[PDB]
Scaffold this active site. Structure first.
Site, PDB file in Angstrom:
ATOM      1  N   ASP A 157      42.218   6.771  -3.471  1.00 52.91           N
ATOM      2  CA  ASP A 157      40.981   6.990  -3.085  1.00 52.91           C
ATOM      3  C   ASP A 157      40.544   6.526  -1.880  1.00 52.91           C
ATOM      4  O   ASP A 157      39.262   6.192  -1.651  1.00 52.91           O
ATOM      5  CB  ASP A 157      39.890   7.042  -4.395  1.00 52.91           C
ATOM      6  CG  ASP A 157      40.427   8.067  -5.433  1.00 52.91           C
ATOM      7  OD1 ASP A 157      40.652   9.181  -4.934  1.00 52.91           O
ATOM      8  OD2 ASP A 157      40.392   7.830  -6.620  1.00 52.91           O
ATOM      9  N   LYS A 190      39.432  18.688  -8.863  1.00 51.34           N
ATOM     10  CA  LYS A 190      38.603  18.965  -9.796  1.00 51.34           C
ATOM     11  C   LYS A 190      37.724  20.261  -9.561  1.00 51.34           C
ATOM     12  O   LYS A 190      36.509  20.445  -9.649  1.00 51.34           O
ATOM     13  CB  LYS A 190      37.490  17.844 -10.216  1.00 51.34           C
ATOM     14  CG  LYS A 190      38.474  16.843 -10.987  1.00 51.34           C
ATOM     15  CD  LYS A 190      37.912  15.394 -10.879  1.00 51.34           C
ATOM     16  CE  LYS A 190      38.824  14.515 -11.772  1.00 51.34           C
ATOM     17  NZ  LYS A 190      38.614  13.087 -11.168  1.00 51.34           N
ATOM     18  N   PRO A 221      42.592   9.404 -16.542  1.00 43.97           N
ATOM     19  CA  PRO A 221      42.169   8.217 -15.673  1.00 43.97           C
ATOM     20  C   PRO A 221      41.198   7.460 -16.502  1.00 43.97           C
ATOM     21  O   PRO A 221      40.725   7.704 -17.766  1.00 43.97           O
ATOM     22  CB  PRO A 221      41.545   9.196 -14.842  1.00 43.97           C
ATOM     23  CG  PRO A 221      40.822  10.359 -15.657  1.00 43.97           C
ATOM     24  CD  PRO A 221      42.034  10.471 -16.553  1.00 43.97           C
ATOM     25  N   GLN A 249      37.134   1.356 -14.924  1.00 37.99           N
ATOM     26  CA  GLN A 249      36.058   1.874 -15.764  1.00 37.99           C
ATOM     27  C   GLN A 249      35.985   1.408 -17.281  1.00 37.99           C
ATOM     28  O   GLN A 249      35.386   1.752 -17.829  1.00 37.99           O
ATOM     29  CB  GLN A 249      36.506   3.371 -15.875  1.00 37.99           C
ATOM     30  CG  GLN A 249      36.206   4.293 -14.609  1.00 37.99           C
ATOM     31  CD  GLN A 249      36.643   5.465 -14.541  1.00 37.99           C
ATOM     32  OE1 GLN A 249      35.896   6.401 -15.384  1.00 37.99           O
ATOM     33  NE2 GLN A 249      37.347   6.171 -13.757  1.00 37.99           N
TER      34      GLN A 249
END
Lengths: 215, 215
Positions: free
Chosen positions: A10, A62, A170, A175
């Site tokens: 990303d 997505k 993910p 996270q």
């Protein structure tokens, strides 16, 4: 996937994305490319990556539109060289079927995203996720995405889709998810920032693999 | 929006997209550009359209990722020249707030998509739509998207967001929605195929506007 590790690339500029992916290529066989990179450098980046690194590319778009537009998005994405595309299940069965029809026509794959990994997923998605997963099974979906941040939910998702389905996850690292715990249920883990923002991406990827092999 | 009509430009090649948008420019002041065109021709198409037609551009990317990625997608989209971006609310409040923060930083606008217009929206989205709309109000969202295909739901969404909020609505024409009925609740209607697949796009746009002006 090589080492059960998928890189979420990303970064938003081609030079940095190429450098990091090249530095960790010996530890993976699959790169997930999303809109941060594609909207910054163009869809041609997918074929460039695929060729340069000889890796599989999952387009994490997505997808969440109506059937007709979903078809167009999948067609453009596969035309660009992607091996698979990630689609949201919350828009319903017709939207997901549209993606499956294009993947069937083009010899590619669809990954169905059931529950998301961030905090906000608890508001609306979590309550519908089991049903979204069952819908996937009914449609013949064989590839799924579920949250590393909630292993109890990942377990329930694995329960619905069975052991034959492929599940990627993910939310590992940045996270809060754990590689080892996530791999108790998922076949492969997706890792972005923990690797691409690291001072030494290759060492970060290597460290994760070391935890994995130990399992 | 000029004539309360927004063109959904979903053709996938630059030449056809430019031709049709030019043919109908006298009837609109706002073009909605989505992934079918952007993934086929590049993000530079947004600035080209904006300049060429001097129209406002709404990027219909139905953003539906985690907060961090949503910020990156919004930043890249506004950098490309878009005046506004459409974002899904289903993923939750943090995902929506990430988009609002970037719009605030860049002087742009976020449109919150509550309920979708296609049949599959009845499976999961519809049941959460009133809550998604209320979440929008609580976050300070002032621009919304709701379904032309279900005017009773559009009425309920208008009820939640109030008369001061701006509401646009897709599903007119090809999906079955009616311009007049939709405009009883929405401020503007979005029309794609009914205009861009028509033998004479300008006549199709003109016909729609004539049924509108008579309101």
């Amino acid at each position: 996937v090589m080492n059960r590790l998928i890189l979420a690339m990303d970064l938003m500029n081609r030079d940095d994305a190429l450098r990091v992916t090249g530095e960790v290529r010996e530890y993976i066989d699959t790169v997930k490319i999303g809109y941060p990179l594609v909207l910054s450098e163009g869809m041609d980046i997918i074929a460039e990556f695929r060729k340069r690194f000889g890796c599989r590319i999952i387009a994490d778009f997505k997808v969440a539109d109506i059937p007709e537009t979903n078809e167009k998005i999948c067609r453009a994405t596969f035309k660009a060289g992607a091996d698979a595309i990630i689609v949201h299940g919350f828009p319903g069965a017709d939207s997901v079927r549209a993606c499956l029809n294009v993947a069937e026509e083009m010899g590619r794959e669809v990954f169905l995203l059931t529950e998301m990994s961030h905090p906000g997923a608890e508001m609306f998605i979590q309550g519908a996720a089991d049903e979204i997963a069952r819908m996937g099974v009914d449609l013949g979906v064989k590839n799924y995405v579920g949250p590393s941040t909630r292993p109890e939910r990942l377990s329930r998702l694995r329960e619905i889709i069975g052991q034959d389905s492929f599940l990627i996850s993910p939310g590992v690292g940045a996270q809060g998810g754990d590689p080892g715990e996530t791999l108790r249920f998922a076949d492969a883990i997706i890792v972005g920032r923990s690797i691409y923002l690291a001072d030494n991406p290759a060492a970060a990827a290597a460290g994760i693999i070391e935890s994995i092999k130990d399992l």
